[PDB]
Amino acid sequence: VRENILFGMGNPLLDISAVVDKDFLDKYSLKPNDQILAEDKHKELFDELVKKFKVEYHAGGSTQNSIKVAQWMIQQPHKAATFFGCIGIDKFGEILKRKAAEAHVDAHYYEQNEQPTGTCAACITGDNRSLIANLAAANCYKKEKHLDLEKNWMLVEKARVCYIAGFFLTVSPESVLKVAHHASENNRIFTLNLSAPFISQFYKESLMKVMPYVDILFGNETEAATFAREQGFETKDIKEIAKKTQALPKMNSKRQRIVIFTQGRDDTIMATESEVTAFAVLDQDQKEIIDTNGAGDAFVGGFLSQLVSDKPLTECIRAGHYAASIIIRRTGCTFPEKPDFH
Ligand SMILES: Nc1ncnc2c1ncn2[C@@H]1O[C@H](CO)[C@@H](O)[C@H]1O
Ligand SMILES: Nc1ncnc2c1ncn2[C@@H]1O[C@H](CO)[C@@H](O)[C@H]1O
Ligand SMILES: [Cl-]
Ligand SMILES: [Cl-]
Ligand SMILES: [Mg+2]
Ligand SMILES: [Mg+2]
Ligand SMILES: [Mg+2]
Numbered sequence: 001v002r003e004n005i006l007f008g009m010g011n012p013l014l015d016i017s018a019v020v021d022k023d024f025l026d027k028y029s030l031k032p033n034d035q036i037l038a039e040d041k042h043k044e045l046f047d048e049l050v051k052k053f054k055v056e057y058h059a060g061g062s063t064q065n066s067i068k069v070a071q072w073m074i075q076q077p078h079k080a081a082t083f084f085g086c087i088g089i090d091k092f093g094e095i096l097k098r099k100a101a102e103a104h105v106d107a108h109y110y111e112q113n114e115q116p117t118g119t120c121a122a123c124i125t126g127d128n129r130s131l132i133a134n135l136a137a138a139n140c141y142k143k144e145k146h147l148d149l150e151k152n153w154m155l156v157e158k159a160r161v162c163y164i165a166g167f168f169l170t171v172s173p174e175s176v177l178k179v180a181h182h183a184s185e186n187n188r189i190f191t192l193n194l195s196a197p198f199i200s201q202f203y204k205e206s207l208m209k210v211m212p213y214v215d216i217l218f219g220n221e222t223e224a225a226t227f228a229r230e231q232g233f234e235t236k237d238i239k240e241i242a243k244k245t246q247a248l249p250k251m252n253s254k255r256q257r258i259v260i261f262t263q264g265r266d267d268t269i270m271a272t273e274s275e276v277t278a279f280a281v282l283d284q285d286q287k288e289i290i291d292t293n294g295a296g297d298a299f300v301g302g303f304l305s306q307l308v309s310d311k312p313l314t315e316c317i318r319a320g321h322y323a324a325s326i327i328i329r330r331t332g333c334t335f336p337e338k339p340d341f342h
Helices: 022-027 040-052 062-074 091-102 136-140 150-158 166-170 173-185 197-202 204-213 221-230 238-246 292-307 313-327
Strands: 006-009 013-019 034-037 056-060 081-088 106-112 119-125 128-134 161-165 189-193 216-220 258-263 266-271 276-279
Touching: 006 062, 006 150, 006 173, 013 040, 013 091, 022 040, 022 119, 034 197, 040 119, 040 128, 056 062, 056 091, 062 081, 062 091, 062 161, 062 166, 062 292, 062 313, 081 091, 081 136, 081 150, 091 106, 106 136, 106 150, 128 292, 150 173, 161 166, 161 173, 161 292, 166 173, 166 189, 166 197, 166 204, 173 189, 173 204, 189 292, 197 204, 197 221, 216 221, 216 292, 221 238, 221 258, 238 258, 238 266, 238 276, 258 292, 266 313, 292 313
Parallel strands: 006 081, 006 161, 013 119, 034 128, 081 106, 161 189, 189 216, 216 258
Antiparallel strands: 013 056, 119 128, 258 266, 266 276
16 A cells, blocks of 8 residues: 555575485485574585585565565565665675665664674585574564664554564564564554474464464474474364364454464464355466575565555455565575565
């Protein structure tokens, strides 16, 4: 509808990808398909990747990807979607700012110089992708230094829908809570992503602190299974987990929670107050698949583009499947000049 109607915040990261071999995964004790945070023991990993293999660089970060995709589907006006995050004052940081602008997103960064711009290694093997996030500057986001400044907070107050990936809970749970409480107080929509199994395992306390404020929860089938185990649900059935998650304690009685769990090429599951329904993924051709992680970010971006236009949930799901089908066959969450969705 109008400028700054959709708000997002998270970790701005420059993706570094390359096809590697079994020896490289074994050397760093990497699982073929996984997403983890970079420890001190992984400093060797990033240098060896860039020195032993052919790498490509693409602007990334989960929430940033979803916001760029939402803006793409909205088309007009420019700057309908806002994004906040922290970066370094370097060449990598200039790449991220340049790409956010070309995407027509209203991006406002917290720039500092103690830490370099964050990066994320994507170690590819065939149809598998092992991700390692070295947050660096991204982990320096401080609400008192950015989110709380008058000029920035005003942008959050213009939003009708807010979205933050669960990944940001490892950096600023206080920022996530300030935004979630504001939405609850002003009967606006607050949405969140489970993001990765490690969020439901090691950061479950911050996750459960924010849950009462979550109007719409997104996640894939492995994140749903981990969340169920850690919360003691005692079931591994995706439809039952969606039902129990939907029923969790909620603050704002004016909006019932909606839970959406994707299952790759299998049906997308949606739980509402009254039932649990399934939506087929009609794009079944596997041949040209490239990036399933980015496909999940694009699914959320498509869904959000229709939620701000006030469309039925059926249409939000169709838009999510459409955007995921475009991004899944490309690198760097890129897409054609204009969407073909009416
Ligand atoms: N800890 C993290 N925080 C934010 N984004 C992440 C994290 N780990 C992986 N990603 C992102 O996931 C995206 C693909 O889904 C990549 O662009 C990558 O940068
Ligand atoms: N193997 C796959 N085949 C087809 N579509 C897929 C596949 N994996 C993911 N997707 C699409 O990406 C979305 C997020 O994973 C899915 O709900 C689906 O729309
Ligand atoms: Cl993020
Ligand atoms: Cl997903
Ligand atoms: Mg090992
Ligand atoms: Mg595989
Ligand atoms: Mg995901």
